[PDB]
Write a structure and sequence with these properties.
The chain is mainly beta and 299 residues long. It is built from no helices and 28 strands. The PDB classes it as protein transport.
């Protein structure tokens, strides 16, 4: 009966945090088990800091960004927001918030203040391991890559068409990119913006639902609105794997999570469902293939 309002993984993707109209819960991804649950109305977008007790959620009603203490069971602080949140990221140092046309950067810890002037951007962004990536506010095909020390950094003409989404690897030395076409998936070095690789998802155009690097950064998982799961070798050219995902009509969004160097989990918000995949390899024939092992309710 409880619908999922928002859901997201933690930085290593060992946890899944979700918000409902009545509460917000945290789960292990593999094995799928609920770690905790907290009665909480009006909880909007919600994020989690690693495997600590530090939780951040946005109040839909009062337009407030809370920092919730999971053991104290109370607010640490509340931050006033001026527009609707689009993205949210947490590190031990910074709180990166994407509200409206702007990216705001607060400090993680007292006094919980803004560290820099607000950055206007193109609508897509990513922050991971102190490394910020966002699209230029007018040149939507371009992306800025900067290290929060903010200061200036590298500019990359990623695509002709506007960039749709972006994904940093686990270390933070590479960024995967795609567009509205969803035909080409490019990989750049965060050091200098040089094109490392260029993948081809397919001939026809599709919207890309999610991307995610493997833990070692050797592989890149991709899911399109065609609802096909792709896997590309980096290896640090077409996909080495394909799998027609099992989707119903109500499904229109999901998120990928690597549980190992050879295991993925696809979380389905509307169906409240988690598909566990194994990435198999035949050393004799030098071929990869995907296998759907388990299908679990959240609950």
């Amino acid at each position: 009966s409880n619908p999922i309002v928002d859901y997201e993984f933690n930085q290593d993707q060992s946890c899944l945090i979700v918000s409902t109209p009545k509460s917000f819960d945290i789960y292990n991804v593999h094995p799928l088990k609920r770690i905790m649950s907290q009665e909480m109305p009006d909880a909007g977008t919600i994020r989690m800091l690693h495997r600590t007790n530090y939780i951040a959620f946005v109040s839909t009603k009062k337009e407030l960004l809370h920092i919730w203490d999971d053991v104290k069971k109370q607010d640490i602080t509340r931050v006033k927001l001026d527009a609707a949140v689009k993205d949210l990221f947490l590190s031990r140092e910074f709180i990166v918030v994407s509200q409206g046309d702007v990216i705001s950067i607060f400090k993680f810890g007292n006094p919980w203040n803004k560290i820099t002037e607000d950055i206007k951007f193109g609508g897509v962004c990513e922050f991971a391991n102190g490394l910020l990536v966002y699209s230029n506010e007018f040149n939507l095909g371009q992306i800025h890559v900067t290290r929060l020390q903010v200061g200036k950094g590298v500019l990359v003409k990623a695509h002709a068409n506007p960039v749709k989404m972006v994904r940093l690897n686990r270390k933070g030395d590479m960024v995967a990119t795609c567009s509205q076409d969803g035909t080409l998936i490019r990989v750049f070095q965060t050091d200098n913006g040089v094109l490392v690789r260029e993948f081809r998802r397919g001939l026809d155009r599709t919207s890309i639902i999610d991307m995610r690097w493997s833990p070692d950064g050797s592989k890149l998982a991709v899911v399109s609105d065609k609802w096909t799961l792709h896997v590309f070798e980096v290896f640090n050219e077409w996909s080495i794997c394909n799998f027609k995902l099992k989707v119903s009509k109500g499904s229109n969004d999901c998120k990928i999570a690597w549980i190992s160097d050879t295991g993925l989990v696809i979380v389905w918000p509307n169906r409240r469902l988690a598909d566990t995949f194994k990435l198999n390899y035949n050393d004799d024939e030098h071929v990869w293939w995907l296998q759907l092992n388990q299908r679990n309710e959240i609950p």
